[PDB]
Write a protein that binds this ligand. Structure first.
Ligand SMILES: Nc1ncnc2c1ncn2[C@@H]1O[C@H](COP(=O)(O)OP(=O)(O)OC[C@H]2O[C@@H](O)[C@H](O)[C@@H]2O)[C@@H](O)[C@H]1O
Lengths: 48, 239
C-alpha cells in the first residue's frame, strides 16, 4: 500500500477472505477489512 | 420577518450601537470589472437557503482591498444578532486548506484524517475556515461538520467559506435583487456559462472576495490569512 499498488490486492483479498473464512482465522479477517475488503463480492469454490 | 438592525461591537470595549441594515454595509465594496480599482459599493449580502438544510447561511461579497476586521465585525455582529451578546467565544481558529478538484485519496487514510479532524473539531469547539466550494477536502470537512452539527448543543460553531467571487455559479442570481436578499434560494444544479463550481451547503457563512476577474483563481488568499490573523488577535486564540 505504501508503494502504490492496489489492483493486485483487490484481486487477491476476496479469495483471501474466502479461504480465511474457510480455514477459521479471525485476525486475518480483522486485518483484511479496512483495506477495501468488499464482503459482498465473495465467490465460492464450486458451482451450484 | 427580517432583522433590520445589527448589534456590532466597538473596537476597544464591549459592544457598540445597533446600526441599521442600510447602515454599516458601505465599507464592503465590489468590482464591476477588472479594470476598476476603487470600485462600487457591493449591495450583495444576506442569507442563502440550500436544499435539504433546515437552517440558512449568511453570505457577503467583499472587495480584495477591503478591511478583514470589518468582515470579522460582520461575523461578530451576526453571532450577536443570532445567539445574543452572551455567545461562546472561540479558543481555536482551525483553518483547513487543500486541493479542490485534484483530491484523490485511499479510503483508509481518508477515514483516518476524518476521524482525527472529527475528534479535533469535537474536543476543540473551533471555528473552521475552509474554501467555500463543494469539491474535495472542503466537501469532506463540510461532511465532518455536518456529522458533528446534528447534536451541536446550543452554540453551533460557524464554518466560514471564503471563496473568490466570479467562480461561483449562483453568484449572478445572488447579486441581482434587493440588498438584504434574505430569502435567496441557491441552485446547485444551475448551469451558468463562464463558471463551473458551486458552493457547499454545509458551510455556515460565506465570504466572496471580488477582484473583478472571472474564472481566475487565487484572489481569496491574503484576505483569508489576514482575516484569520485578525480573529487570532481579536479573540486571543491560536490559528
Ligand atoms: N477553491 C477552488 N474550487 C474549485 N476549483 C478550484 C479552486 N481552486 C483552484 N481550482 C481549480 O481547480 C483545479 C484543481 O486544483 P487543486 O490543486 O485541486 O486545488 P488548488 O489549486 O490547490 O486550490 C487551492 C485552493 O483551495 C483552498 O484550499 C485554498 O484556499 C486555495 O485557494 C486547479 O487547476 C484550479 O484551476
Amino acid at each position: 500500500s505504501k508503494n502504490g499498488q492496489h489492483n493486485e490486492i483487490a484481486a487477491c483479498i476476496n479469495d483471501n477472505l474466502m479461504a480465511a473464512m474457510m480455514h477459521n482465522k479471525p485476525h486475518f479477517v480483522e486485518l483484511y477489512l479496512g483495506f477495501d475488503a468488499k464482503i459482498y463480492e465473495l465467490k465460492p469454490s464450486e458451482e451450484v | 420577518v427580517a432583522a433590520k438592525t445589527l448589534l456590532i461591537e466597538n473596537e476597544d470595549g464591549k459592544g457598540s450601537t445597533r446600526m441599521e441594515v442600510q447602515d454599516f454595509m458601505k465599507r464592503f465594496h465590489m468590482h464591476a470589472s477588472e479594470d476598476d480599482k476603487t470600485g462600487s459599493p457591493s449591495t450583495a449580502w444576506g442569507t442563502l437557503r440550500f436544499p435539504t438544510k433546515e437552517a440558512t447561511a449568511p453570505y457577503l461579497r467583499l472587495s480584495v482591498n477591503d478591511d478583514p476586521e470589518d468582515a470579522l465585525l460582520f461575523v461578530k455582529a451576526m453571532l450577536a444578532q443570532k445567539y445574543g451578546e452572551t455567545y461562546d467565544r472561540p479558543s481555536l481558529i482551525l483553518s483547513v486548506t487543500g486541493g479542490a478538484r485534484n483530491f484523490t485519496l485511499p479510503p483508509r487514510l481518508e477515514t483516518a484524517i476524518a476521524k482525527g479532524l472529527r475528534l479535533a473539531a469535537q474536543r476543540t469547539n473551533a471555528w473552521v475556515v475552509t474554501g467555500g466550494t463543494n469539491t474535495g477536502v472542503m466537501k469532506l470537512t463540510g461532511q465532518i461538520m455536518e456529522a458533528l452539527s446534528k447534536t451541536q448543543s446550543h452554540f453551533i460553531p460557524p464554518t466560514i467559506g471564503i471563496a473568490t467571487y466570479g467562480v461561483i455559479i449562483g453568484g449572478d442570481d445572488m447579486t441581482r435583487g434587493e440588498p438584504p436578499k434574505i430569502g435567496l434560494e441557491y441552485e446547485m444544479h444551475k448551469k451558468d456559462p463562464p463558471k463551473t463550481t458551486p458552493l457547499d451547503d454545509n458551510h455556515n457563512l460565506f465570504l466572496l472576495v471580488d477582484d473583478g476577474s472571472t474564472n481566475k483563481f487565487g484572489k481569496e488568499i491574503k484576505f483569508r490569512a489576514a482575516f484569520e490573523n485578525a480573529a487570532g488577535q481579536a479573540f486571543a486564540a491560536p490559528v
